[PDB]
Design a protein around this ligand. Sequence first.
Ligand SMILES: O=c1[nH]cnc2c1ncn2[C@@H]1O[C@H](COP(=O)(O)O)[C@@H](O)[C@H]1O
Ligand SMILES: O=c1[nH]cnc2c1ncn2[C@@H]1O[C@H](COP(=O)(O)O)[C@@H](O)[C@H]1O
Ligand SMILES: O=c1[nH]cnc2c1ncn2[C@@H]1O[C@H](COP(=O)(O)O)[C@@H](O)[C@H]1O
Ligand SMILES: O=c1[nH]cnc2c1ncn2[C@@H]1O[C@H](COP(=O)(O)O)[C@@H](O)[C@H]1O
Ligand SMILES: Cc1n[nH]c(C)c1S(=O)(=O)Nc1ccc2c[nH]nc2c1
Ligand SMILES: Cc1n[nH]c(C)c1S(=O)(=O)Nc1ccc2c[nH]nc2c1
Ligand SMILES: Cc1n[nH]c(C)c1S(=O)(=O)Nc1ccc2c[nH]nc2c1
Ligand SMILES: Cc1n[nH]c(C)c1S(=O)(=O)Nc1ccc2c[nH]nc2c1
Lengths: 330, 330, 330, 330
Amino acid sequence: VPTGGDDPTKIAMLGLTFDDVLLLPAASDVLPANADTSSQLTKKIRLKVPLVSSAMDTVTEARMAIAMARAGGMGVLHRNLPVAEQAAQVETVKRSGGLLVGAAVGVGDDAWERAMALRDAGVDVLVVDTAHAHNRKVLDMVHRLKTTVGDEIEVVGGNVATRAAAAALVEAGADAVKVGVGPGSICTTRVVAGVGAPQITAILEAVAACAPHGVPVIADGGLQYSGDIAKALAAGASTAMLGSLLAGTAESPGELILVNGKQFKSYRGMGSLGAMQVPEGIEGRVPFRGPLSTVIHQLVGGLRAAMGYTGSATIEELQQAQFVQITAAG
Amino acid sequence: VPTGGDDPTKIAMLGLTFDDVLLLPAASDVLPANADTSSQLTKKIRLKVPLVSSAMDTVTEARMAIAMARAGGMGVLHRNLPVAEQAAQVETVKRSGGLLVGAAVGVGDDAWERAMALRDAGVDVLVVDTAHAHNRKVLDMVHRLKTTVGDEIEVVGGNVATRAAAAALVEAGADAVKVGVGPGSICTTRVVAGVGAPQITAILEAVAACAPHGVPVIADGGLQYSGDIAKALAAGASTAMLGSLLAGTAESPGELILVNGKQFKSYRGMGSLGAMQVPEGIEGRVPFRGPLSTVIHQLVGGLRAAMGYTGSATIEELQQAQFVQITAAG
Amino acid sequence: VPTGGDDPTKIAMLGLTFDDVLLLPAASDVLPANADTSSQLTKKIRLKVPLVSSAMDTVTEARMAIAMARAGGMGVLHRNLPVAEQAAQVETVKRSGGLLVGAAVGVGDDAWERAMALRDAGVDVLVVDTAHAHNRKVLDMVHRLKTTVGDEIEVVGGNVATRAAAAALVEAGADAVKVGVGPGSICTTRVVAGVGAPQITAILEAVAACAPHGVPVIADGGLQYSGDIAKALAAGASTAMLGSLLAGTAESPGELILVNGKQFKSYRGMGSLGAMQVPEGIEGRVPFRGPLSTVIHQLVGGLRAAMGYTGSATIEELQQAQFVQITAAG
Amino acid sequence: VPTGGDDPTKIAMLGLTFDDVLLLPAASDVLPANADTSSQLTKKIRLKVPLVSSAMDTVTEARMAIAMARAGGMGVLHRNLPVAEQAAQVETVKRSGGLLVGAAVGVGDDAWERAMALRDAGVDVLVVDTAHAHNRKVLDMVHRLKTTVGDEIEVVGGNVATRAAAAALVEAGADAVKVGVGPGSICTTRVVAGVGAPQITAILEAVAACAPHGVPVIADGGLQYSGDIAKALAAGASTAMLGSLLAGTAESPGELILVNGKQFKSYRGMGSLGAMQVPEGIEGRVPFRGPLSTVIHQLVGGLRAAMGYTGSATIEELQQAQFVQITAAG
Ligand SMILES: O=c1[nH]cnc2c1ncn2[C@@H]1O[C@H](COP(=O)(O)O)[C@@H](O)[C@H]1O
Ligand SMILES: O=c1[nH]cnc2c1ncn2[C@@H]1O[C@H](COP(=O)(O)O)[C@@H](O)[C@H]1O
Ligand SMILES: O=c1[nH]cnc2c1ncn2[C@@H]1O[C@H](COP(=O)(O)O)[C@@H](O)[C@H]1O
Ligand SMILES: O=c1[nH]cnc2c1ncn2[C@@H]1O[C@H](COP(=O)(O)O)[C@@H](O)[C@H]1O
Ligand SMILES: Cc1n[nH]c(C)c1S(=O)(=O)Nc1ccc2c[nH]nc2c1
Ligand SMILES: Cc1n[nH]c(C)c1S(=O)(=O)Nc1ccc2c[nH]nc2c1
Ligand SMILES: Cc1n[nH]c(C)c1S(=O)(=O)Nc1ccc2c[nH]nc2c1
Ligand SMILES: Cc1n[nH]c(C)c1S(=O)(=O)Nc1ccc2c[nH]nc2c1
């Protein structure tokens, strides 16, 4: 073994991230304005725009969830607050019309009671929200929700970064699988635990387990540019979840911060000291970006451009596009 | 598949850019001063110097086109202006003697009328100027021009970054194929759409489709140093198109800008907000470089040095040179 | 041979360091709080926490050794001081209860007398401390100690970076093998001598020689984050030795230094000019980190997180985890 | 072909530089102080220290040549001065005892007359000094010198970066071959001409042509640290030529320059505008380093350390050492 030892499987794969690849152009009869950007969030739920906002307390509360749904995507309400307040935020979103909304739950002692309160409030999607879903407690939670409320509510499980973990969630009854261990902009899992998987390889592996069973993959974490959304979907994901890219918008929680003459908003990991009060997230800031509607317009515009370049009339066609791998000289 | 999934073709190639390679020296009887730098711009048109200026409104109007032709190359007049004005710039170049000139046209509603006005003004080369030529509308335009005015005017099509796209332009009747999707210094296609192809690999692939049919390849975008011109031609291109390297010259459009005691000129993508008024270009500045004649002298001097090192008496011999691939430690 | 010459063995391997890999998550029934972090320091000695402090005069004297043992690890007392003083530091550690302690010896003229004084003071572990243990003088020292005092004292040999060197120490009777040639944060062996081995590959190779004989490997040098400890153990090491990560703690030797409003402590290589008075170490500073107990808590917390993600109930299970190799885009 | 086109030989090799590799330690009975650092400069001339100073007007005139010879190496006098003055510098070196000295000549009109004046002055080594020796004019010069004065004077030819070029110089009668196209610290050949070869691969290839014929290789350019000297020799070179590493010494030409409170000396390429008055070198400065004797002591000290780590008793044994290739994470 050229990298050491006598076991070829010790280093099991070469992991690629978004910056390691570009989409290859292909023959196209598709104009960006004419592409169809709709895609499955879950087995049953299709979004007009393949984007969902992160379940984070500096990204998604009712205002963001309402704005995301109006824009054609969806928000996932964070769970760092009392059950009653989270359920009230679901109701608030529903007071603004026939808008889709999701909400995060954990696997702890109060997670089931949280899920039932969200159900009663009319939530459309429950996201079982963990850093590592390949665990009997997480799989049991997904299965029990699906068996209990799965006729009326779609159940998402995550996060995973391997084929086997994705397969386990599929077996448990997940209506979608969320992919990303380590890639988030505010994440320190890779430095604290030394654990992770580069996101393009993680998506390719998860899709190999999920697509044969008709289960969509949500690419969660590490997206920095609109072009990364196109790369995530071309790797086989059906939607992308965004934290950093949406945290600086008017509709996110938090106030404006002025630093050296420039405007910022606070953005922090849910595993940061601040959010919890051994952290696996940090607390920082991102530039202020203005209204959500305008950010989504630019992100979808980039996606539409990719669809034009690759000849993809639909997201399902984009999922079949090819990559070229690039070097550091990039 | 070591990088993920079960499909070896998902990542279709490893893309190299200029900074990934160096030309290997070889046995030489060639002195730099004695090398022949002439090369085909198109099937019928040979230039004394294998360089053409970009069709950009901060690079090529009549002054630059005149200077480029006098230097042994050619300019391609930009099309971000009324048809009458572009045709008048062609006439202005012709008032300065028997000088070659090209001009860009699009594929939109007024593109045909633009092409005919340029024809009437005495243009030598029409460049069908798109970000992605592998499209029936672009191919049809190339073919219709070739069939209509192709006895008197050479028709260039672009841009492409793949073998199949190059082959399609050849089939459509292109007299030259222009290569470059994503590599321009002011380009944001790779970050906005996530689409592109590293330029050495793009040229190698395009040449594999074009050279067997006797169609020259124009390497367009990403050239930063004179040595990059030699690399582009050794990869098989017949000429190089330059934007950034020529934008800071006296002959480019625009005035001098003084910033922190240094001199600059404005340089912007034609897909930038400023040029258009979802942008795929930015607006910036490059250092002021003085007269065009002096810049071309240094660029051709570097090319001549490469020809001496590689034993290439002609550009056709340089196209057969070999590379060594280098690492980040470079 | 693609990299030059006609001998494929001239470049014998591709060396990976900590930053080249990540641990892959795997199926887990392990909660971080419930993982067992104990591991063999030597054949006979098991630590509660798999961490030992470097034998350096800016890291380990009696205060650090006492604190490390109380925290569940061990200190190795440095040998840059008179024999009588080093032996007195061993006695000081013993005055604080039933605490494990190690101490470094060289192979020079006074090394044997040093070892016997340490023996008489009640040392538990003797570390034969060299930059390159694959040498008859070092191997003889290890063997002679083992034959003379090996019933009452565990004998560690190092350092090595190759399989053959590790095998030689095992043959000589080493109770543990310490791995690391070149990777230390204050080390200049790689720039001065041009010699070294990236630490993940060095550990994989040393473990291939040591594990079949039941001899634990101590990963020494280059660890910068808690996640690196998990990577070192997953590569097959049984403990990690830390210098930089512990040098800024209250318990290390040296006073606080104030620079530009921030607090630091001095940290220097034992091969630096300062320590010796052709240096192979430098003298610098690291941020002040507060009490040792708190640093160890965060480091072990990260290790525990890795054990949870990889489904490792014990360190022996963690040694079987798998990696993904990452690119520069990381 | 994964990198483009249909020709696997277009990219002929993967080129490694010094920073791409480390020397592997091996079993050693060698103490640094006891290693033998002597090595062949040419077929007939053996140096005590395997180092020669560059033929540059900011590195080697008589003072440096005298100091280098006294230190056990040799200087090569630059040729950017009248023939009479260069010959007088040779005589000056000879007035200081039985000291070896070399001198550069070109291949131009006055090169033969220069060589004969140097011969008459008692030069020991003539270096045919070109950027690309694979050329009939350079090969003819080497052969004619060897046939004319080769009984009394050793004739070095260079520079080369390929096996075939090295073989040609050997055939022409070279007593040593100097390797390096593009790697010099002040060199811009790689950016101006786009031509070069990473130096470890260049040495491995040149040695494959030279060693079978008993012709030593001089590694010239790109050495930044003492460890690079050990790497160059382990790749198979017999000596190293140094420019940058010696330009800041007291014995180099030029005065002290004070910039922002620090001391520097001027260092410039012989192909820079300043030296010539299309440049392939730049003009800059390097830190002042003090006496040559002290710099050589540190460089040889690093070499001696490498010999100890690799178990190399002699330079011929070091030439058989092995490498590990490292990544960017290095
Ligand atoms: O504290 C944390 N540590 C690690 N990952 C986090 C943390 N908080 C949120 N995440 C994940 O990071 C994603 C956002 O990543 P981003 O879009 O790159 O900023 C979220 O959707 C989570 O999956
Ligand atoms: O706005 C833009 N976005 C992307 N590419 C552009 C844009 N404008 C011009 N280009 C291309 O960039 C080339 C110049 O690249 P440069 O020489 O690297 O600056 C031009 O010849 C075009 O092919
Ligand atoms: O001067 C030196 N040069 C090279 N390595 C050293 C020196 N001093 C200590 N070391 C080694 O560096 C280790 C600490 O590495 P660190 O934890 O990366 O700072 C120590 O345990 C030694 O193995
Ligand atoms: O102007 C120049 N351009 C390119 N190489 C040069 C020039 N002048 C000297 N050299 C070479 O650079 C070597 C010194 O490289 P250095 O030790 O890396 O600074 C010299 O021995 C020459 O072989
Ligand atoms: C550290 C942790 N354990 N369980 C949760 C929930 C968290 S978190 O608050 O920090 N959020 C996430 C979410 C997704 C992640 C992917 N990698 N790391 C992640 C962390
Ligand atoms: C975004 C776009 N679509 N069509 C055009 C024309 C443009 S442009 O104005 O921005 N010019 C170019 C030209 C070449 C390119 C290669 N990659 N991207 C490019 C952009
Ligand atoms: C240069 C030297 N020779 N012998 C010793 C002891 C030293 S040291 O003081 O500098 N310590 C170490 C320890 C471990 C090392 C791994 N690589 N280099 C190292 C240096
Ligand atoms: C550009 C040139 N042609 N001939 C000479 C002599 C020169 S130089 O003055 O610039 N010196 C060197 C010497 C070695 C080199 C390796 N690569 N480039 C080099 C340049």
